[PDB]
Amino acid sequence: LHALVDLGERLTTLKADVLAKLPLTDALRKALAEAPKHTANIARKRHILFIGKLMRDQDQEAILVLLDQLDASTRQYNERFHNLERWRDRLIAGDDADLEKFVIEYPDADRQQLRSLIRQAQHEVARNKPPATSRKIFKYIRELDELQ
Protein backbone atom coordinates (compact mmCIF):
# COMPACT_ATOMS: atom_id res chain seq x y z
CA LEU A 1 0.00 0.00 0.00
CA HIS A 2 1.92 3.03 1.32
CA ALA A 3 4.69 0.32 1.40
CA LEU A 4 4.85 -0.34 -2.43
CA VAL A 5 5.06 3.33 -3.11
CA ASP A 6 7.66 3.68 -0.39
CA LEU A 7 9.55 0.80 -2.09
CA GLY A 8 9.08 2.53 -5.35
CA GLU A 9 10.65 5.80 -4.36
CA ARG A 10 13.56 4.09 -2.53
CA LEU A 11 14.45 2.59 -6.05
CA THR A 12 14.57 6.17 -7.48
CA THR A 13 17.43 6.73 -5.06
CA LEU A 14 19.73 3.87 -6.21
CA LYS A 15 22.83 3.76 -8.46
CA ALA A 16 22.10 2.14 -11.85
CA ASP A 17 24.77 -0.32 -10.97
CA VAL A 18 22.61 -1.70 -8.16
CA LEU A 19 19.35 -1.44 -10.23
CA ALA A 20 20.97 -3.40 -13.07
CA LYS A 21 21.20 -6.41 -10.57
CA LEU A 22 17.46 -6.11 -9.53
CA PRO A 23 14.70 -7.94 -11.49
CA LEU A 24 12.72 -4.93 -12.79
CA THR A 25 10.41 -4.96 -15.77
CA ASP A 26 11.44 -2.64 -18.73
CA ALA A 27 8.47 -0.47 -17.79
CA LEU A 28 10.02 0.07 -14.34
CA ARG A 29 13.51 0.68 -15.58
CA LYS A 30 11.97 3.32 -17.92
CA ALA A 31 9.74 4.93 -15.21
CA LEU A 32 12.82 5.06 -13.07
CA ALA A 33 15.13 6.78 -15.63
CA GLU A 34 12.38 9.16 -16.40
CA ALA A 35 11.86 10.03 -12.66
CA PRO A 36 14.18 13.08 -12.28
CA LYS A 37 12.40 14.82 -15.23
CA HIS A 38 9.47 15.20 -12.81
CA THR A 39 10.25 18.42 -10.86
CA ALA A 40 6.64 19.79 -10.19
CA ASN A 41 4.71 18.60 -7.10
CA ILE A 42 1.92 17.21 -9.21
CA ALA A 43 4.32 15.63 -11.77
CA ARG A 44 6.39 13.99 -9.06
CA LYS A 45 3.42 12.58 -7.03
CA ARG A 46 1.83 11.21 -10.21
CA HIS A 47 5.03 9.53 -11.36
CA ILE A 48 5.64 7.94 -7.93
CA LEU A 49 2.08 6.58 -7.76
CA PHE A 50 2.49 5.34 -11.25
CA ILE A 51 5.78 3.78 -9.99
CA GLY A 52 3.69 2.41 -7.08
CA LYS A 53 1.18 0.78 -9.52
CA LEU A 54 4.09 -0.55 -11.52
CA MET A 55 5.62 -2.34 -8.53
CA ARG A 56 2.73 -4.82 -8.77
CA ASP A 57 4.38 -6.32 -11.90
CA GLN A 58 7.57 -7.00 -9.98
CA ASP A 59 8.92 -9.68 -7.79
CA GLN A 60 8.70 -7.60 -4.62
CA GLU A 61 10.19 -10.27 -2.39
CA ALA A 62 13.31 -10.43 -4.66
CA ILE A 63 13.57 -6.67 -4.73
CA LEU A 64 13.18 -6.47 -0.90
CA VAL A 65 15.74 -9.21 -0.36
CA LEU A 66 18.37 -7.40 -2.45
CA LEU A 67 17.69 -4.05 -0.71
CA ASP A 68 18.03 -5.81 2.67
CA GLN A 69 21.49 -7.00 1.47
CA LEU A 70 22.47 -3.43 0.53
CA ASP A 71 21.23 -1.95 3.85
CA ALA A 72 22.92 -4.75 5.83
CA SER A 73 26.22 -4.11 4.14
CA THR A 74 25.85 -0.42 4.93
CA ARG A 75 24.98 -1.37 8.56
CA GLN A 76 28.12 -3.41 8.75
CA TYR A 77 30.06 -0.50 7.35
CA ASN A 78 28.61 1.83 9.99
CA GLU A 79 29.32 -0.57 12.88
CA ARG A 80 33.06 -0.71 11.80
CA PHE A 81 33.12 3.08 11.23
CA HIS A 82 31.81 3.95 14.69
CA ASN A 83 34.07 1.23 16.27
CA LEU A 84 37.06 3.01 14.69
CA GLU A 85 35.81 6.44 15.85
CA ARG A 86 35.75 5.00 19.45
CA TRP A 87 39.21 3.54 19.06
CA ARG A 88 40.55 6.96 17.86
CA ASP A 89 39.02 8.83 20.75
CA ARG A 90 40.15 6.19 23.26
CA LEU A 91 43.70 6.20 22.08
CA ILE A 92 43.95 10.06 22.07
CA ALA A 93 42.34 10.30 25.56
CA GLY A 94 44.23 7.37 27.14
CA ASP A 95 47.70 5.98 27.42
CA ASP A 96 49.88 2.99 26.64
CA ALA A 97 47.38 0.47 28.11
CA ASP A 98 44.95 1.47 25.36
CA LEU A 99 47.59 1.34 22.65
CA GLU A 100 48.22 -2.29 23.77
CA LYS A 101 44.57 -3.24 23.64
CA PHE A 102 44.39 -1.67 20.17
CA VAL A 103 47.34 -3.62 18.82
CA ILE A 104 45.97 -6.85 20.26
CA GLU A 105 42.85 -6.30 18.07
CA TYR A 106 45.17 -5.10 15.13
CA PRO A 107 48.56 -7.04 15.67
CA ASP A 108 49.86 -5.72 12.33
CA ALA A 109 49.68 -2.08 13.52
CA ASP A 110 53.02 -0.20 13.32
CA ARG A 111 53.30 0.55 17.04
CA GLN A 112 55.93 3.21 16.70
CA GLN A 113 54.01 5.17 14.06
CA LEU A 114 50.75 4.95 16.04
CA ARG A 115 52.58 6.01 19.26
CA SER A 116 54.09 8.97 17.41
CA LEU A 117 50.64 9.86 15.99
CA ILE A 118 49.02 9.65 19.49
CA ARG A 119 51.65 11.89 21.10
CA GLN A 120 51.23 14.56 18.39
CA ALA A 121 47.36 14.46 18.71
CA GLN A 122 47.51 14.58 22.57
CA HIS A 123 49.80 17.62 22.21
CA GLU A 124 47.35 19.32 19.78
CA VAL A 125 44.59 18.57 22.27
CA ALA A 126 46.55 19.93 25.22
CA ARG A 127 47.86 22.98 23.45
CA ASN A 128 44.42 23.53 21.77
CA LYS A 129 45.60 23.30 18.13
CA PRO A 130 43.45 22.30 15.08
CA PRO A 131 43.09 18.64 15.77
CA ALA A 132 44.79 17.47 12.46
CA THR A 133 46.62 14.47 13.78
CA SER A 134 43.41 12.90 15.08
CA ARG A 135 42.09 12.86 11.50
CA LYS A 136 45.46 11.08 10.57
CA ILE A 137 44.91 8.50 13.30
CA PHE A 138 41.31 7.84 12.06
CA LYS A 139 42.78 7.49 8.57
CA TYR A 140 45.58 5.06 9.62
CA ILE A 141 43.25 2.88 11.67
CA ARG A 142 40.71 2.76 8.82
CA GLU A 143 43.61 1.44 6.69
CA LEU A 144 44.31 -1.31 9.29
CA ASP A 145 40.52 -2.29 9.36
CA GLU A 146 40.48 -1.97 5.61
CA LEU A 147 37.48 0.29 5.94
CA GLN A 148 37.40 1.15 2.26
From Swiss-Prot:
Q: Which GO terms describe its cellular component?
A: cytosol
The protein's predominant localisation is cytoplasm
Q: Which Pfam families match?
A: DarP
**Which compartments is it annotated to reside in?**
Cytoplasm
A biological process from GO: assembly of large subunit precursor of preribosome
Output the Gene Ontology terms for molecular function.
Answer: ribosome binding; rRNA binding
**Is Transferase a UniProt keyword of this protein?**
no
What are the UniProt keywords, alphabetically? Cytoplasm, Ribosome biogenesis, RNA-binding, rRNA-binding
Q: Does the keyword RNA-binding apply?
A: yes
**Family, similarity comment:** Belongs to the DarP family.
What this chain does, per the record?
Member of a network of 50S ribosomal subunit biogenesis factors which assembles along the 30S-50S interface, preventing incorrect 23S rRNA structures from forming. Promotes peptidyl transferase center (PTC) maturation.
Name of the protein described by the UniProt record: Dual-action ribosomal maturation protein DarP
